[PDB]
């Protein structure tokens, strides 16, 4: 029903502002971006860069993902990053998330032609 590069895009990218500016954006992107939809996704980022900066990071370094596939990309540079995390009282439907801001560099996994980011794997 999604491609795969349409839902990185939904799930990753908020290139609408250059960083997360209240503790309750995450509360609102997950809810949103459908991510608490049938149950609350427990982990998610969100990547504050243009579309384009994000998919030039499939032509930087490539670096092995967690799962040990090698088809990650590290961005050279770091980017404006939120991390949203559901709390210890999180409760489907009520989900509820940390939301923290940060400035990092981006990993992420890149598939097919034009090939561009289907996975976010980490940050560092």
């Given at each position: 029903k999604e491609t795969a590069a349409a839902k990185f895009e939904r799930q990753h990218?908020?290139?609408?502002?250059?960083?997360?500016?209240?503790?309750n954006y995450c509360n609102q992107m997950m809810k949103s971006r459908n991510?608490?939809?049938?149950?609350?996704?427990?982990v998610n980022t969100f990547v504050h860069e243009s579309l384009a900066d994000v998919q030039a990071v499939c032509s930087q370094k490539n670096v092995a993902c967690?799962?040990?596939?090698?088809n990650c990309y590290q961005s050279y540079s770091t980017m404006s990053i939120t991390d949203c995390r559901e709390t210890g009282?999180?409760?489907?439907?009520n989900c509820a998330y940390k939301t923290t801001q940060a400035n990092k560099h981006i990993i992420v996994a890149c598939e097919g032609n034009p090939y561009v980011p289907v996975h976010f794997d980490a940050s560092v």
């Amino acid at each position: 029903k999604e491609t795969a590069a349409a839902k990185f895009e939904r799930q990753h990218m908020d290139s609408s502002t250059s960083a997360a500016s209240s503790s309750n954006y995450c509360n609102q992107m997950m809810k949103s971006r459908n991510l608490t939809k049938d149950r609350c996704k427990p982990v998610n980022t969100f990547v504050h860069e243009s579309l384009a900066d994000v998919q030039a990071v499939c032509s930087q370094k490539n670096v092995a993902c967690k799962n040990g596939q090698t088809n990650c990309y590290q961005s050279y540079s770091t980017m404006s990053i939120t991390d949203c995390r559901e709390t210890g009282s999180s409760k489907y439907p009520n989900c509820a998330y940390k939301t923290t801001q940060a400035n990092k560099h981006i990993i992420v996994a890149c598939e097919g032609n034009p090939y561009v980011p289907v996975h976010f794997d980490a940050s560092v």
